Amino acid sequence: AKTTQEKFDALKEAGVFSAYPGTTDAKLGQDMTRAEFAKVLVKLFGLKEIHGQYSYKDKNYDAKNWAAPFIEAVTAEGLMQAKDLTKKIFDFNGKITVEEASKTLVTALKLEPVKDAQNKATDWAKGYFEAAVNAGLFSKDANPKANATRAQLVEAAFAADEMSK
């Protein structure tokens, strides 16, 4: 029964997770940007990076943005999309929430969103969050609307990896 730090070390060695930006620390208590999480999904599921394509109009989303190839890949794969379909805003510096992470992993693992889902999640996410809890990606006491901790994202990513591996 591996600890969270053991799960992080294994995923870091595998090139799926990085230390907290600018540090060599796991910082399991810290949050993660949607940009960083897009890279985790690409590494976790071996997606192809997409260079020279930009599907969003976020300020400073362009060829100089390191995350664009990863964000484009998870967009093409149908794992993530804009928060705003009119302004085409991905919110790449926004922190990934537990219910957002749930949608990406449930979609990636082809798990069915739960019918008659009843939980704390935003309306759009209730089925995704429920499926994620039922598959053991997040604990029953996770707040779906909360920013996911790197600890929660390690636990979810390790569980997803084993469910495919």
Ligand X SMILES: CO[C@@H]1O[C@H](CO)[C@@H](O[C@@H]2O[C@@H]3CO[C@](C)(C(=O)O)O[C@H]3[C@H](O)[C@@H]2NC(C)=O)[C@H](O)[C@H]1NC(C)=O
Distance CA 81, CA 135 (A): 23
In the complex, minimum distance from the CB of residue 105 to ligand X, in angstroms, rounded to a whole number = 10
Tokens of 150: 């790197």
Q: Could you give the angle at the alpha carbon of 110 between the alpha carbons of 109 and 115, nearest 5°?
A: 120
Judged by CB under 6 A, the stretch of 16-24, 100-108, 113-121, 142-150 that binds ligand X is 100-108
Q: Decide if residue 82 touches ligand X (CB under 6 A).
A: yes
C-alpha distances out from residue 95 to 30, 101, 113, 123, 153, Å: 10, 10, 23, 19, 12
Q: Site size for ligand X, by CB under 6 A?
A: 9
Q: Which of 12, 27, 43, 83 binds ligand X (CB under 6 A)?
A: 83
Q: Which stretch binds ligand X (CB under 6 A): 24-32, 54-62, 80-88, 153-161?
A: 80-88
List of residues contacting ligand X (CB under 6 A): 80-83, 85, 100, 103-104, 124
